[PDB]
Amino acid sequence: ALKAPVVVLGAGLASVSFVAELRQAGYQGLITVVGDEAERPYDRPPLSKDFMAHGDAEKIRLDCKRAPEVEWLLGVTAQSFDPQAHTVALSDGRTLPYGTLVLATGAAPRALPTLQGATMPVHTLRTLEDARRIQAGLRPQSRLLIVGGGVIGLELAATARTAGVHVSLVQRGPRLMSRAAPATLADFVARYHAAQGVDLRFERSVTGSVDGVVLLDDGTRIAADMVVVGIGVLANDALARAAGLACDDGIFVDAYGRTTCPDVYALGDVTRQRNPLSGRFERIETWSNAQNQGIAVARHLVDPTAPGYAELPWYWSDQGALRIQVAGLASGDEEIVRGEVSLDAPKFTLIELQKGRIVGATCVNNARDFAPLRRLLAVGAKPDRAALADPATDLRKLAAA
Amino acid sequence: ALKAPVVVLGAGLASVSFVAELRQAGYQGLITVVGDEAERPYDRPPLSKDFMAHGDAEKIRLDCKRAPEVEWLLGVTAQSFDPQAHTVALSDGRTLPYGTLVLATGAAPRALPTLQGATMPVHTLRTLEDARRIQAGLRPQSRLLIVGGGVIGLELAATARTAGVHVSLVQRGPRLMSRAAPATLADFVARYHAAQGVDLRFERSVTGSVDGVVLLDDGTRIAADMVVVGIGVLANDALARAAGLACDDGIFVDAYGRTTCPDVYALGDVTRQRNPLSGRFERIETWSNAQNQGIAVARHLVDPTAPGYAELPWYWSDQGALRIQVAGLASGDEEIVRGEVSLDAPKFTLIELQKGRIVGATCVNNARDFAPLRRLLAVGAKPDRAALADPATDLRKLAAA
Ligand SMILES: Cc1cc2nc3c(=O)[nH]c(=O)nc-3n(C[C@H](O)[C@H](O)[C@H](O)COP(=O)(O)OP(=O)(O)OC[C@H]3O[C@@H](n4cnc5c(N)ncnc54)[C@H](O)[C@@H]3O)c2cc1C
Ligand SMILES: Cc1cc2nc3c(=O)[nH]c(=O)nc-3n(C[C@H](O)[C@H](O)[C@H](O)COP(=O)(O)OP(=O)(O)OC[C@H]3O[C@@H](n4cnc5c(N)ncnc54)[C@H](O)[C@@H]3O)c2cc1C
């Protein structure tokens, strides 16, 4: 069932959350974690937020207190594993035996093929090292180009503008946040960033670059001192692929975290898993999944009577003045707008319904509403639609009832 | 590894191929097959072909000779399985114990929601019973409407025209055979069927029906004596889903046929698996996959040193005068056309290349070319493109060299 010793590959949030839950649940056997970064395990969301602004890494470290008696092999890369011999080969020449193996290796930013042989600074933003390297080029009045209009690029955009950096952003699609965000939210977010001086370019792609200038597919040019590419990430599933596990930009797992290989599990950004709301498999790229899936898989390993992972997806994003929170699906057959959608003191809530059932919710500067909406979302509530729009209605009431 | 006893759910081609390989490979333990159809196991491709024309079911039975000492529970449905207790519950009230469970339950035709409460004959074509029921309504000069332009619908269309039946066909897309067929092939196939009197309607959908007439989304009508729906199939993965296996319109499996659940495997139409040419997961809906995956998974269960499933995909279709064969991918960056594409004695070959490498091939009334092209495809050959077009070139030569 849960066979000792436990080895976890990756030392990010999913891994930390998993090994802490193992200990809290009562497992007292060996746990060894292999982490390729030579860094005290740390959280990523600050990297495009407060960290990029203030630069104190000792404010972003994960709490490994609830994970006593774990050996963390930092700065070491797992190079392969042999699922028959039950061993992992490490880059330092050592080998770890395992009873249970857990792949928590995350994902890495996609490169932009058109900028491959570029001769100007081109970075991505995933690691503490990336953030330090980017932060060191945020010279006031310098020009930054961001490729991709996902939340991390937008968080960087807002951080950069706040630092006095001129920001341009190129987005292949007609809208920002094309992944898991209601169109109404995306349109509003574009209006916000535009108003803050971000030069937004929709429906354009990068074709290449020459001497410090980026080329676009409309035949035009954008000069920049630095490009940050943020067009999404790819699962770090190479070990799983080589060992014969079912993978496709992500290791396939069930609700117990099981891969297709006996005694090998996977969690976090590296997994492709069932979204309970859509009923489809997808790679979920959020902080809450990394933590919550790690916890669920550990809990069930120690107590096989515990249910499989069942949490519904949600995330947040801090983009200057906008505190954004998004849960569930981006769309259904109906959207209910609570409040006015306005650049003047932005504060609104969106609710997505499918045949009367809540399937998604968004809060912008409205954190008190988010928690009740997530509970209503969780039980598939079908509240009165007039009430939901009715600003008099208090949402915490409904959830309680 | 391979633990006795073996239980297989489903008694179609994948199942028959698997249990035959188990015996041929040397496994002598118990094998029990559960099949919900009360029929001697039979092959499906004849159902839209020679069978629909001649009606002799004793010409379409599968050969279970290479599978001695198998108990076939025909006319029995597996209702659930318990992967911890290692048992399967049957619809006749019995329970089967298993060491190794194999899900080979295939797929079923999708229903058309717009025709749900229709009051006219609406059938799909998957089973021997379906074919008999459809064949009994192919009255000469009757009017048949087919929904969907996939190969089975087109095979039925050609069979029906040959029987003197007036045939209309409604296709949501701009082209027939939208799944895994080169556009050049699809365009030609439309010209053939049109020339044979099939009334083709592209870019239309069915909105409903009233008193023997089908309604379309262009606001028009088609009267018919019978509708056959052929808009694709859905994996029969309900048992796997209920038991906690990773599924998404298909049970996820690696190259060994392993699901995410220890001691449970899956094969054939029910699986979602890696396509080696695209490197993506897909549900492969072909005769050759059912046979070849069944054989590979069995072989590796008996001999763990054997490689995992590795065959590249291919299928054929018989549509009146057209003997169509298709291997690999529908497209690449280049297509080479061997011969003329003409309704006058149709006979041509298509070759799809990606950066000089063969990734796909089509033969129409040109079976001698198909086998060499599949071998060239298998080794990722990069032959001379001028030679490939050069009709002088004999293809069997190249493959040999
Ligand atoms: C800049 C940024 C901002 C974000 N903001 C938010 C946010 O506001 N809200 C939100 O919901 N989410 C946010 N996220 C997303 C979030 O942080 C991720 O979902 C989360 O980090 C995933 O955790 P993980 O443990 O699964 O993967 P990871 O954090 O990527 O950890 C995996 C670790 O394993 C390492 N590894 C990989 N391969 C090997 C190997 N062979 N051997 C050893 N180690 C290996 C990796 O290098 C990595 O260190 C943000 C992410 C980034 C990068
Ligand atoms: C009309 C038609 C024409 C075709 N023509 C071609 C062709 O020319 N070329 C080609 O490449 N392919 C063709 N195919 C495709 C091909 O035949 C399939 O790919 C193949 O049948 C798949 O085999 P299978 O064993 O995986 O699934 P199946 O043949 O569907 O067998 C599965 C069996 O398991 C049964 N079952 C399901 N659930 C349970 C349960 N809970 N308990 C017990 N039994 C269960 C099913 O009813 C079914 O009998 C055709 C298919 C059809 C229907």
CSV table of C-alpha atoms in Angstrom, one decimal, chain A residues 46 50-61 128 132 135:
chain,number,residue,atom,x,y,z
A,46,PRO,CA,5.7,36.1,-4.6
A,50,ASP,CA,6.1,41.4,-3.6
A,51,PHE,CA,9.5,39.7,-4.2
A,52,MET,CA,10.0,41.3,-7.6
A,53,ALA,CA,9.4,44.6,-5.7
A,54,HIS,CA,11.4,44.1,-2.5
A,55,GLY,CA,13.8,41.2,-3.1
A,56,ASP,CA,13.9,39.5,0.3
A,57,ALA,CA,14.0,35.7,-0.4
A,58,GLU,CA,13.8,34.9,3.3
A,59,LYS,CA,10.1,36.1,3.2
A,60,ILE,CA,9.1,33.5,0.6
A,61,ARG,CA,10.5,30.2,2.0
A,128,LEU,CA,14.0,32.5,-7.8
A,132,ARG,CA,16.6,37.9,-9.5
A,135,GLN,CA,14.7,42.2,-11.3
